[PDB]
């Protein structure tokens, strides 16, 4: 149908922009954030793909939870996630962010950042290499490529 074709093209265009312009919030917790710096480094330059760190959560699209999430830190992470406007995505990085990690059976560690925020991508490793994190970012981009919001709305 003409309307179906129009909405398909429009949300192909919309998903392309969001996929190609990703702005992670400048947010790192532990040793996993060093591999974020090495992904930002010249070797695996993240700025090629349109992935740029922004300090303010208002101007951020993705939250890369890279490090251990503690009980004393969970409210701040939830606060910045809430203050991030939509559409927003979450990439947990490393064992600590995925589940508990080396500190799973601890009194002061949250066993998974997905207990706090909805996580879109999980990156495995301790720490995941910069290439592993880049693969996770590209996988997030491909996940964005498949979103059909206007197509869902047209048939709604």
């Amino acid at each position: 149908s003409r309307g179906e074709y129009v909405v398909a093209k429009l949300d192909d265009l919309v998903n392309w922009a969001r996929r190609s312009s990703l702005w992670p919030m400048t947010f790192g917790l532990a040793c996993c954030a060093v591999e974020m710096m090495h992904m930002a480094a010249p070797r695996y330059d993240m700025d090629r793909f349109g992935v740029v760190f922004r300090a303010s959560p208002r101007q951020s699209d993705v939250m890369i939870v890279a490090g251990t999430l503690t009980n004393k830190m969970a409210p701040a992470l939830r606060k910045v996630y809430d203050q991030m406007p939509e559409p927003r995505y979450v990439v947990s990085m490393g064992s600590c962010a995925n589940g508990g990690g080396y500190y799973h059976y601890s009194y002061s560690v949250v066993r998974g950042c997905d207990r706090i925020v909805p996580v879109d991508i999980y990156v495995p490793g301790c720490p995941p290499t910069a290439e592993a994190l880049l693969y996770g970012i590209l996988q997030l981009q491909r996940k964005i490529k498949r979103e059909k919001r206007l197509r869902i709305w047209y048939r709604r």
Partner: protein, 318 residues
């Protein structure tokens, strides 16, 4: 046809702003041993389009503590004045030919000051307030120094008309004539446009996005467009003021090519400086102009008052 001329002045400026964003990305990357955006399009040519679409399709939010009226007006004022600053520029023919073309630019810059102040105050947050007051101090210093420097340089010209600037620089360059004022003017234009090392109103390392901390999506993109348009406009003003291009009335496109090349060189120098230097402290910026530039600016103003009189080289009034 005047509306067509307005559109032909506005739309290419916005396109050049977007591609200046791209160029700054790539230049900083290559100076930092990276490549910069080269994935979104061929050599990363669709990156500005992707960024604009993402920003204008993302949700904007007004903070619960904000004053909504001045929260919305500030990006409007910033972008409106950034676009308005271009109308008296002769390239080689101004869109609007003014008798006092420089005082209009000074007044419009001083008005464009208030966009960041009102956005910082309206946001109702401590980082925004700090950014606004840093803007206040920066504007104080750069405003006084810029006013006196422009007075001297135009005193070498004879009037406040930029076409008269072209006629003055028909033979040699104001950079050859008055290079110390040119250096101080370049520093003052950096401060006016809030570029490194004077990017203190929005200092990421110290403040979390500074005055535009609460701004997101479309309103933020307007602040970015206003900043980059101001960068290009100030570099164009510097090129017209100090690097005068030869003008042929029957083929004016040559002046356009020369002027565009000089403006691009100055803008790339801006990006180069940002890549090279650290950031000032705003008290040190105030002490830089007041305690160093201001005495030398006054001495050079006296010298450029005296010089045409003692050498019988006073420019024509018209």
């Amino acid at each position: 046809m005047f509306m067509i001329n307005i559109l032909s002045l506005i739309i290419p400026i916005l396109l050049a702003v977007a591609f200046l964003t791209l160029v700054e990305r790539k230049v900083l990357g290559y100076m930092q041993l990276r490549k910069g955006p080269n994935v979104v399009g061929p050599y990363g040519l669709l990156q500005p389009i992707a960024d604009a679409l993402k920003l204008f399709t993302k949700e904007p939010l007004r903070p619960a503590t904000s004053s909504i009226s001045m929260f919305i007006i500030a990006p409007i004022l910033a972008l409106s004045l950034a676009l308005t600053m271009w109308v008296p520029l002769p390239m080689p023919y101004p869109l609007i030919n003014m008798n006092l073309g420089v005082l209009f630019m000074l007044a419009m810059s001083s008005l464009a000051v208030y966009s960041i102040l009102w956005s910082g105050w309206a946001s109702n947050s401590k980082y925004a307030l700090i950014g606004a007051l840093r803007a206040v101090a920066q504007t104080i210093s750069y405003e006084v120094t810029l006013a006196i420097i422009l007075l001297s340089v135009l005193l070498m010209n004879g009037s406040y008309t930029l076409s008269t600037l072209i006629t003055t620089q028909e033979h040699i360059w104001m950079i050859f004539t008055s290079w110390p004022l040119a250096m101080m003017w370049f520093i003052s234009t950096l401060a006016e446009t809030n570029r490194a090392p004077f990017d203190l109103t929005e200092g990421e390392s110290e403040l979390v996005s500074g005055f535009n901390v609460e701004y997101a999506a479309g309103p933020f993109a307007m602040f970015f467009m206003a900043e980059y348009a101001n960068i290009i406009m100030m570099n164009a003003f510097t090129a017209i003021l100090f690097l005068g291009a030869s003008h042929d009335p029957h083929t004016p496109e040559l002046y356009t090519i020369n002027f565009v090349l000089k403006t691009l060189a100055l803008t790339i120098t801006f990006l180069w400086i940002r890549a090279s230097y650290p950031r000032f402290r705003y008290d040190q910026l105030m002490h830089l102009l007041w305690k160093s530039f201001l005495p030398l600016t006054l001495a050079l103003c006296m010298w450029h008052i005296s010089l045409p009189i003692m050498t019988a080289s006073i420019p024509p009034q018209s």
